[PDB]
Design brief:
The complex is a heterodimer of chains A (12) and B (235). Chain A is mostly helical. Helices cover 67% and strands 0% of the residues of chain A. Chain A contains one helix and no strands. Chain A has one helix at 4-11. Chain B is mainly beta and 235 residues long. Chain B has two domains: 1-114, no CATH class; 115-225, no CATH class. In chain B, strands 11, 13, 14, 15, 18, 19 and 20 form a seven-stranded mixed β-sheet that branches. The radius of gyration of chain B is 17 Å and the shape is globular. The two termini of chain B are 32 Å apart. Classes of the chains: A mainly alpha (12), B mainly beta (235). The interface between A and B is medium-sized, with 11 and 30 residues. Bound molecules: potassium ion (2 copies). The site of one potassium ion has 4 residues of chain B, from β8 and β14. Chain A: It comes from Homo sapiens (Human). Chain A: The modification Phosphoserine is found at residues 3, 5.
Chain lengths: 12, 235
């Protein structure tokens, strides 16, 4: 799993 | 946000199912949910299942979790009266909110990790408070940490989170621009500064440890909760 915060960081 | 039923009832010994939907799709294309049990408003939530299926070792074997499509189900096989509680599901939304909670399902039955919050108290509207959580019993620098609050008689509400490496500080919509989360990995502490306080910020504020393997956090992955500290805002 990739965490929800890491996903948001990568998109931001 | 997330959708779960307001209530479920069962007789002792039956199998109970509670289903939650509405979570955002994660980076790996899947969906992930956590289940958080609260037996009384005067007590901290307890994670019964996280990351869809993972059961903390101290949680009774009768709790299990599953996922189907974008939905998740908590199953209690052989329910007991002691299982009466509100069960909140948690996940992430599609974009800006890594942690979101359902409204809670109330179950009626017919017939070494420590997190220690401080800094609560009474404040007047417009003032500020600084909350602190001291952690022990785990490698603090490896894990994301979060703050979650609960107004009197209301459900769980995400306040803020921070990744293990100090980055990824994100905030709940109701506190945007008024909250700052920080952490000190050397002291095993996470801090929440709340400014421009409002009456409706009143509630119990819980520190929460995340279990995500990558040092991040989200609503599916809280594995430990503090005892809470009370914030009371009133003029
Ligand atoms: K929320
Ligand atoms: K007031």
């Amino acid at each position: 799993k990739i965490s929800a915060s890491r996903k948001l960081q990568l998109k931001t | 946000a997330l959708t779960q039923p307001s209530s479920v009832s069962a007789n002792p010994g039956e199998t109970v199912k509670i289903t939650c939907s509405g979570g955002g799709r994660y980076y790996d294309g899947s969906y992930y949910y956590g289940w958080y049990q609260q037996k009384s408003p005067g007590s901290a939530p307890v994670t019964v299942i996280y990351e869809n299926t993972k059961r903390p070792s101290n949680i009774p074997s009768r709790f299990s979790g599953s996922k189907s499509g974008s939905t998740a189900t908590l199953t209690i096989t052989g329910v007991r009266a002691e299982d009466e509680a509100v069960y909140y599901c948690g996940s992430a939304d599609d974009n800006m909110n890594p942690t979101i909670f359902g409204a809670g399902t109330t179950l009626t039955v017919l017939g070494a990790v420590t997190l220690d919050e401080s800094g609560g108290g009474l404040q007047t509207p417009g003032g500020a408070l600084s909350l602190v959580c001291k952690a022990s019993g785990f490698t603090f620098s490896s894990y994301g940490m979060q703050w979650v609050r609960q107004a009197p008689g209301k459900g769980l509400e995400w306040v803020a989170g921070i990744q293990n490496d100090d980055t990824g500080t994100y905030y709940g919509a109701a506190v945007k621009g008024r909250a700052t989360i920080s952490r000190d990995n050397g002291q095993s502490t996470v801090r929440l500064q709340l400014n421009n306080l409002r009456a409706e910020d009143t509630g119990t504020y819980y520190c929460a440890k995340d279990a995500s393997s990558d040092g991040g956090y989200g609503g599916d992955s809280i594995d430990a909760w503090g005892h809470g500290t009370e914030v009371i805002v009133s003029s």
